[PDB]
Design a protein around this ligand. Structure first.
Ligand SMILES: CN1CCc2c3c(n(-c4ccc(C(N)=O)cc4)c2C1)CC(C)(C)CC3=O
Length: 208
């Protein structure tokens, strides 16, 4: 079964601002998603120091970037801590409400969209380049789920039927028609070098 939910009003407002504002510096979406992955990998790494069995679902801590021109998707995969159903429906949304209000206030005060990560809502920068975002995730304490939203004020959550991940998150960006530059190897390498050169986990850019 597919469950449909309404985003918190502030989040729906944040997504409309990201989709409708004229802002050419869209490339920052990739550093924001890699930062989310890096924070999830730091979390499972730290948890594993007091409970080694937390790595039974996979010892490798890494990030993969996978472009697919046929499907017009850019996927960011990590073997981080993952997210539970509670994280997907409620917990992260609650945390995001306070950051969204502060970010929207900073934008009115003169800040720019690139500062989104300082408010802990950088995941939503995915909507600068994607018309739809699908998030597949598996946390050690829960089942594999698929979250999805094309904005418009709602999102869906379902148990995932696809290939089992072990542990971690996959963020699938269904790119907008005019944002296919983010499927090009040289363009992705350039962005990772500029904004994500010191991430402490191997970043592998897959080729087509
Ligand atoms: C600090 N941020 C707060 C808000 C937030 C959100 C989402 N993440 C999020 C995205 C990816 C990962 C990851 N790669 O493990 C973790 C959290 C975050 C993190 C996704 C989500 C689909 C649950 C939506 C969301 O609000």
């Amino acid at each position: 079964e597919v469950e449909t939910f309404a985003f918190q009003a502030e989040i729906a407002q944040l997504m409309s601002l990201i989709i409708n504002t004229f802002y050419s510096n869209k490339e920052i979406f990739l550093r924001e998603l890699i930062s989310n992955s890096s924070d999830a990998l730091d979390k499972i790494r730290y948890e594993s120091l007091t409970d080694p069995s937390k790595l039974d679902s996979g010892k490798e801590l890494h990030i993969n970037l996978i472009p697919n021109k046929q499907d017009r998707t850019l996927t960011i995969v990590d073997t981080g801590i993952g997210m539970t159903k509670a994280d997907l429906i409620n917990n992260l949304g609650t945390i995001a409400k306070s950051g969204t209000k502060a970010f929207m206030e900073a934008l009115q005060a003169g800040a720019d969209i690139s500062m989104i990560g300082q408010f802990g809502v950088g995941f939503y920068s995915a909507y600068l380049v994607a018309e739809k975002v699908t998030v597949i995730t598996k946390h050690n304490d829960d089942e594999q789920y698929a979250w999805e939203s094309s904005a418009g004020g709602s999102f869906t959550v379902r148990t995932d039927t696809g290939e089992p991940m072990g542990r971690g998150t996959k963020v699938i960006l269904h790119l907008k028609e005019d944002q296919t530059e983010y499927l090009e190897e040289r363009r992705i390498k350039e962005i990772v070098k500029k904004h994500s050169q010191f991430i402490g986990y191997p970043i592998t850019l897959f080729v087509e």
